[PDB]
Amino acid sequence: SMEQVAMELRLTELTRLLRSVLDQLQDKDPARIFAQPVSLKEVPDYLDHIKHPMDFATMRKRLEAQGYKNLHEFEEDFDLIIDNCMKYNARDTVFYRAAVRLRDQGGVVLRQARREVDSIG
């Protein structure tokens, strides 16, 4: 149907905007601490601690399959990145501190993304 196409075009355009958002958030992680999944070879107990692991590569795979229907879904995954790290790692660690800085800096980006998603529809 033509309606299904229109909906698909909207999803494609959201995907375009979320790609730009993802790029901007990942620049706030210049140490690449959150770039890839935590290695279960190197942290074999991780899944005993963290039930829903997340990282920027995993988000990018979902994004490119147009797997985010709305901004809320995308933000859920970004918050997992931050929140997983702040639980597994202690306050005094470069990991925790990296997450805090990512959260604070990403807030700005996400605030305007929300306005754009609402604005363009």
UniProtKB/Swiss-Prot annotation:
Where exactly is the Glycyl lysine isopeptide (Lys-Gly) (interchain with G-Cter in SUMO2) cross-link placed along the chain? 41
Q: Where does tissue-level expression of this protein occur? A: Highly expressed in testis.
Q: Where in the cell is it found?
A: Nucleus; Chromosome
Q: Which residues form the Bromo domain?
A: 9-113
> What does this protein do, in the record's words?
Scaffold subunit of various histone acetyltransferase (HAT) complexes, such as the MOZ/MORF and HBO1 complexes, that acts as a regulator of hematopoiesis. Plays a key role in HBO1 complex by directing KAT7/HBO1 specificity towards histone H3 'Lys-14' acetylation (H3K14ac), thereby promoting erythroid differentiation.
Its subunit composition reads: Component of some HBO1 complex composed of KAT7/HBO1, MEAF6, ING4 and BRD1/BRPF2. Component of the MOZ/MORF complex composed at least of ING5, KAT6A, KAT6B, MEAF6 and one of BRPF1, BRD1/BRPF2 and BRPF3. Interacts (via PHD-type zinc finger domain) with unmodified histone H3. Interacts (via PWWP domain) with dimethylated and trimethylated 'Lys-79' on histone H3.
What is the recorded name of this protein? Bromodomain-containing protein 1
- What is the protein's species of origin? Homo sapiens (Human)
Stretch of the intact protein here: 555 to 674 of 1058
